[PDB]
Amino acid sequence: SMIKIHTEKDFIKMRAAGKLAAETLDFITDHVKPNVTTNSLNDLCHNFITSHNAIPAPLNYKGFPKSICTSINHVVCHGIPNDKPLKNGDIVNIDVTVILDGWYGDTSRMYYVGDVAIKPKRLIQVTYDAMMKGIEVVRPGAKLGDIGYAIQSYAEKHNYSVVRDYTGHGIGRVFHDKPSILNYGRNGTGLTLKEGMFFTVEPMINAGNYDTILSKLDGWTVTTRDKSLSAQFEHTIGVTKDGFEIFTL
Ligand SMILES: [Mn+2]
Ligand SMILES: [Mn+2]
Ligand code: NA
């Protein structure tokens, strides 16, 4: 597979798209509360994005019917906004992608709905830290499998499981580009990271068993086979002379 190598001019564009994607996530926070629907949140983020001269990449992407993904509780990823009210104690991932001047910024976060219990809180914390362990190996000369190994080792040694079938990806003027960034792997295996690569790191971590099911009904929604909670965070990153840069802050 072909890995695109980027110039400084491209980093500039990615910083702007990343920032706008981050700010959308900052913006929606105060709106997440009990008895709000994910449809309301979708419209909020949709209008935030378009009023900043940008396009929501998920809208009609391979038919996806909405502008953001909202994944509640045992939903693992790509949950579709709907009319169901959020409940006190729920956890939700909101995943945004903006296209700004032709360049994609892709990021997701976990949100608490009302007062959340200790177990959900611990799951979210380990997920965030596992993501960061993956990002922290990134530098020219490190190997792609180093990323998945850091994530997997951290999650599993904290007593959680790693979702295998859905991955990070290259990104830039394209939403999903080469290579796949697996969230599991053996250390020191796979292609060599080079200065100027852009990609996402987006691990999904389950409280129960690692096994997931894709909805045949809507074709998008992934849930845990065992109905245990799952959490995810995502950043878009770039490889620099000194390691990594996170664009989605
Ligand atoms: Mn995303
Ligand atoms: Mn992504
Ligand atoms: Na979830």
Angle at 114 between CA 84 and CA 202, to 5 degrees: 75
Technique used by the depositors:
X-ray
Cis bond leading into 179, ω under 30°? yes
Is 235 annotated in a binding site? The answer is: no
- Please state, as a whole number, how many other Cβ atoms lie within 10 Å of the Cβ of residue 161: 21
- Of all ligands present, the nearest one to the C-alpha of 200 is 2
Q: What is the CATH number of the domain that holds 196?
A: 3.90.230.10
Number of domains the chain contains:
1
Tell whether 10 is in a known binding site: no
Ligand nearest to the CA of 92: 3
Tell me the longest C-alpha to C-alpha distance in the chain: 48
Cβ–Cβ < 8 Å for 230, 210: no
Gap from CA of 205 to ligand 3 centroid (Å) = 9
Classify the C-alpha dihedral 120-122-125-130 as positive or negative. negative
Q: What is the resolution of this structure in A?
A: 2.0
Query: Could you give the CA distance from residue 227 to residue 205 in angstroms, rounded to a whole number?
Result: 13
How many Å lie between the centroid of ligand 2 and the Cα of residue 157?
25
Alpha helices in the chain (DSSP H): 8-28, 38-50, 118-136, 144-157
122 touches 62 (CB < 8 A): no
* Structural domain that includes position 11: 1-249
220 among the known binding-site residues? Answer: yes
